[PDB]
């Protein structure tokens, strides 16, 4: 079939009609980014020659090619720790949560670490770790930071976010009640703080519900972490290919160096060895080049991840789709094998009504404009209200300012303004 690009939507545009939400929801979404890859290393002489003296001596004819290949792989391996360090190790202190988890109704128990386990990971982190899942001079170097250490950095960032807001990311961690922290985050998206307090129970309940949905999504859908699985699969495939190439003859009587050596005298053995060297060296060079390109891709991802940690977790972003869809309020990191998972909490308007509007109201010849909000009408009376949440107020001189008169503004409404 021909694919659809989506449903159609004809917006009821007119020169005097505005739609304003009267309710909202809280959404929590998941974003997954790769940070690092396995720090592999390949011995440029052992791969090609094993323990053969004759082969090793023939390789001297190629000068520095052998060492260049090891230098390149070493550089990649080092960079992999640099990438991890930049994404997670950006908190000056390891912060801890209080023994009493009173956050005004907001339940963070699924993202906070579990003290009963051998590795202090959160419930969500255990799900992430459970879901993501030859000797010829080939080795693997361990990462500098261990999974437990990553969990501790993640925990510190989370503890900071919960108890001191974004303050800890600029200076000292300064405690604030959680509900007040949310109030600031609401003012930060253009919604007056009284909206939070008057709906605190609702907001906390929607938040808690969203987290439960995340647990189910991750538990049931393995494909959810496909980006991290993809990095693993590509490196595994590249490495298996490098190994399989050792079986190619490349014109030789045998792919096995020992079969050549055990049967032929040097004047002939060298011919067969030389062609195997050429083939194996080319195969190894191909491998290294591909790893350099792949390494660059991962680094770019790591740089993005580090940026998001700084702008989504340690503050409140104004970039439109940067920290999830909807208006951003806050984010929480979780660790994952070779990567980071962000839970982005956003505000989404969710019930709009059709109101009549006007750019201004003229009273006794004076043109009055709102300081904040817009003028609306229910068909009988005019009110002024904040843009992102319907909350009508009587239009007074404390709501509007005056500039110009009835003859300048196009579409100005004839009404009165109350002076207290």
């Amino acid at each position: 079939y021909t694919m659809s690009l989506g449903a159609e939507n004809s917006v009821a545009y007119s020169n005097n009609s505005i739609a304003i939400p009267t309710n909202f929801t809280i959404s929590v979404t998941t974003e997954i980014l790769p940070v690092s890859m396995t720090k592999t290393s390949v011995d440029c002489t052992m791969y090609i020659c094993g323990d053969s003296t004759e082969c090793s001596n023939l390789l001297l004819q190629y000068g520095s090619f052998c060492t260049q290949l090891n230098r390149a792989l070493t550089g990649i391996a080092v960079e992999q720790d640099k990438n991890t360090q930049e994404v997670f190790a950006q908190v000056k202190q390891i912060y801890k949560t209080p023994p009493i988890k009173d956050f005004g109704g907001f339940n963070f128990s699924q993202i906070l670490p579990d003290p009963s386990k051998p590795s202090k990971r959160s419930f969500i982190e255990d799900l992430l770790f459970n879901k993501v899942t030859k000797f010829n001079g080939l080795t693997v170097l361990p990462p500098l930071l261990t999974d437990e250490m990553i969990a501790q950095y993640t925990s510190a960032l989370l503890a900071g976010t919960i108890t001191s807001g974004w303050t800890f990311g600029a200076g000292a961690a300064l405690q604030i009640p959680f509900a007040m922290q949310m109030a600031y985050r609401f003012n930060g998206i253009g919604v007056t703080q009284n909206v939070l307090y008057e709906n605190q129970k609702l907001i906390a309940n929607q938040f808690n519900s969203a987290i439960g949905k995340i647990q189910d999504s991750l538990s049931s859908t393995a494909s959810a972490l496909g980006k991290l699985q993809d990095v693993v699969n590509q490196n595994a495939q590249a490495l298996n290919t490098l190994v399989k190439q050792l079986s190619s003859n490349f014109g030789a009587i045998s792919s096995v160096l020992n079969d050549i050596l055990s049967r032929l005298d040097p004047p002939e053995a060298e011919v067969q060895i030389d062609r195997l060297i050429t083939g194996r060296l080319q195969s190894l060079q191909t491998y290294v080049t591909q790893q350099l390109i792949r390494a660059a891709e991962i680094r770019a991802s790591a740089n993005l991840a580090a940026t998001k940690m700084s702008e989504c977790v340690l503050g409140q972003s104004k970039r439109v789709d940067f920290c999830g869809k909807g208006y951003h309020l806050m984010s929480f990191p979780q660790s994952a094998p070779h990567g980071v998972v962000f839970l982005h909490v956003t505000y989404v308007p969710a019930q709009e009504k059709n109101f009549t509007t006007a750019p201004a109201i003229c009273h006794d010849g004076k043109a009055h404009f709102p300081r904040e909000g817009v003028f609306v009408s229910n068909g009988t009376h005019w009110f002024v209200t904040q843009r992102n949440f319907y909350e009508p107020q009587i239009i007074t001189t404390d709501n509007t300012f005056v500039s110009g008169n009835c003859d300048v503004v196009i579409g100005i409404v004839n009404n009165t303004v109350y002076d207290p």
Binding site: S41, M46, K134, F135, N136, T139, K244
Partner: protein
């Protein structure tokens, strides 16, 4: 059949006609000793960078 390595007793079963085995990389994994018909595993001798 030659090589360099460390031999240990295996815990796997060969069919009565099989003489040696191989791994995923198609290299020698194990052999049947010709005098005592027992199966030995071949482990590469340890190595690493310094």
């Amino acid at each position: 059949l030659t090589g360099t390595g460390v031999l240990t007793e295996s815990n796997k079963k060969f069919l009565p006609f099989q003489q040696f085995g191989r791994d995923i990389a198609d290299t020698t994994d194990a052999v049947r000793d010709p005098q005592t018909l027992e199966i030995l595993d071949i482990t590469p001798c340890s190595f690493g960078g310094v």
